[PDB]
Each structure stands twice: as C-alpha cells, then as structure tokens.
C-alpha cells in the first residue's frame, strides 16, 4: 500500500488526536457560545489613531489603549445603519462567534462594548495587512509559500467545521498577515452555525461554489471549494474563474472546466481538481474521509500539521514592521468622526451585544 506499518500507525494516531482535540475545543466553544462576554471596555480607554478600513461593513480603526500603550483594531458599527441595511443578526452573530472561538489563526476579540450610537469590537491589531496586497504586489506565491498559507486555512476550517460553523467569506482580501507571517481570519459576518444545509446567497463571485450559484441548499463543502479557489489564486496570481461581469464568472464556475498555468505542479493540479469539483459526491472535504483527503494529499506531503498549528514553522515572508502602531501595510482613508449621540439608539435590537 502507500504506507508501511510505521507510517500508517503514525497517521492513524495523528488523526485520532485531531478528533480528541476537536472534541475538547467544541466543549470550550459551546460554553462561551451559551454565555457570551459583554461590555469589557469603553471608548475613552482608547486613543483613535487611523482608519485601517472602511466600507458598507462599517469602519475599522487603529486605536491605542491609553494605559498599556497596546494597539488594537477597533471595528465600529453605526447601530442605525446596521438596522437600515438589515444586518442585525449578522452583526450580533459575528460578535458572538468571535468571543466564543479560540484558534491561533482566528483573530482575538480582546474587548467589546457599545454606546448610544455604535457597537465596538476591539480586536488584536494584525499589522501585516491583507494577503491581497502582498499577492498583487509579488504577483504570485511559489508553491511552498502558498502551501504554508493553505495549511493554516485547512486547519482553521477543520476547527470551524467541527463547531458546525460554515465560513463563506474566504478570499485574499479577508486574510491578514501577522508579525510572524502567519494568517489571521477576522471577518465573520457571513459565518453561520449549520450542522446540515443552509440556503443564503452570499459570498464573492470568484469564490462562489457552484451549488450556491445554482440556488441549492448547501453545506460546509462550499468552504472547501473556496479553499481551492484561494490556493489557485495564491499560486497563479489570478483566480480560476474570472470575467468582466459576474454572470460570466458564474457560467465558468458551474461548467466543470478549469485551466491551470503551466508552472503548476501536477500535485497541485490534482488537489485543485478535487477541491474545484462541481460534483458534490466527489469533492474533497465532502467525502467519507472528510478533511483527511485534503491533509493527506500529496501536495501537502511536506506539511507538518502540528508544527503549523504550534507556529513553529518559519514563515516564507515577514511583512515590514517599524513599530507597534505601524500602519504601512494598510491603505489610507479619509478620517471621519466617531459621533456618539446623547440619546440611546436601537437599544432593544442590540441588547445581546
């Protein structure tokens, strides 16, 4: 067979240890899920420094804690705008997930609180910026470099899926690089507790699984599809399915055809054909052997999964870092006020926050 006795025993033991870890992690998650933390700081504990990101999702600002001098990334949501955009449940659920999960590649919510006008999530500051920027700058990542990031996503989804959390928002724009060169996943607005199927059309065109496009009930296998898109884009510098307009992208996604750059290794192409599999009965991550079909694939043969988890692997790339508040890996944005009204707004809606 493919493994002799020693290798088979070691792999089996490793896979059983993953099960044991995940069962404990689920126990710990569910305790915090059922009893969420609230109101662990306040606005005047922090100096506002700079806007790190802004969009329909709200704002994220670099802030400095006045007493420790520690920097953080503070997501600010306008309660009235959340209500207007019908994002109450997503906003509450994002914070509830972030305060309950614990994994080395998931951003840590250090504090959260609200005031008359806004909701605030104070997360660790991840100074390296988005993978997206580095990828577009360098062009493409070599296979070992892509593999280092991909392994972190595999482990993170293995963790999330064990908690029955579907992620749904994977793309380079949503992956940050920390000071040690490791990945941080931050955005949980599309994540959902789903043990079975769910139906919402959400995501980003290039990363949508065919079953989402086709208006099917779908499951955590959409995250494994998205991983295939991500690995492809990291290694090629462009995603597998693109076009001028989303509808043309969707036609390519559902077609069952994907083409690869000539520099992709055969191992990489084989993995990608099995992740970018339109047939759900054949997609890696959706079969009887679960995540192990991915983790045991030849393309990952050099990956020491425990060493990645323990953050003991030397990263291929360390972003430039000049100090605790350096923002050079983020874009510049016009700076807007943080208005706090004298009157409480939307109090009932956000009781749980």
């Amino acid at each position: 067979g493919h493994m002799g006795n020693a290798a088979a025993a070691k792999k089996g033991s490793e896979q059983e240890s993953v099960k044991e870890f995940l069962a404990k992690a689920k126990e710990e998650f569910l305790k915090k899920w059922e009893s969420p933390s609230q109101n662990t700081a306040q606005l005047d504990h922090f100096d506002r420094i700079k806007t790190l990101g802004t969009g329909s999702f709200g704002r994220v600002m670099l802030v400095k804690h006045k007493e420790t001098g520690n920097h953080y990334a503070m997501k600010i949501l306008d309660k009235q705008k959340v209500v207007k955009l019908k994002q109450i449940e997503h906003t509450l659920n994002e914070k509830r997930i972030l305060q309950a999960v614990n994994f080395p590649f998931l951003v840590k919510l250090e504090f959260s609180f609200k005031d008359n006008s806004n909701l605030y999530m104070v997360m660790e500051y991840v100074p390296g910026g988005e993978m997206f920027s580095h990828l577009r700058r360098i062009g493409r990542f070599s296979e070992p470099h892509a593999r280092f990031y991909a392994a972190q996503i595999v482990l993170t989804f293995e963790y999330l899926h064990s908690l029955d959390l579907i992620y749904r928002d994977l793309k380079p724009e949503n992956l940050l690089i920390d000071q040690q060169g490791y990945i941080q996943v931050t955005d949980f607005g599309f994540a959902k507790r789903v043990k079975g199927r769910t139906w919402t059309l959400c995501g980003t065109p290039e990363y949508l699984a065919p079953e989402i496009i086709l208006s099917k009930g779908y499951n955590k296998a959409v995250d494994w599809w998205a991983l295939g898109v991500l690995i492809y884009e990291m290694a090629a510098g462009y995603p597998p399915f693109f076009a001028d307009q989303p509808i043309q992208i969707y036609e390519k996604i559902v077609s069952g055809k994907v083409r690869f750059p000539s520099h992709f290794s055969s191992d990489l192409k084989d993995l990608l054909r099995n992740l970018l599999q339109v047939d759900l009965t054949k997609r890696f991550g959706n079969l009887k052997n679960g995540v192990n079909d991915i983790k045991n694939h030849k393309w990952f043969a050099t990956t020491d999964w425990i060493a990645i988890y323990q953050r003991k692997v030397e990263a291929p790339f360390i972003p430039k870092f000049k100090g605790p508040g350096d923002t050079s890996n983020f874009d510049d944005y016009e700076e807007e006020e943080i208005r706090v009204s004298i009157n409480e707004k939307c109090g009932k809606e956000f009781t749980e926050f």
Binding site: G55, E173, G203, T204, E206, L208, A236, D244, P261
Partner: peptide, 18 residues
C-alpha cells in the same frame, strides 16, 4: 494570455461581496 485576460476583466482590485 491568461494574465492579460485577468487584467482585461477589470477585476484585479479588491472584490466586494454580492
């Protein structure tokens, strides 16, 4: 080339959710 096609798509920048 595929790269040139990517540039031509106009979708080389940050991509929003649907």
């Amino acid at each position: 080339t595929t790269y040139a096609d990517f540039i031509a798509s106009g979708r080389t920048g940050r991509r929003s959710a649907i």
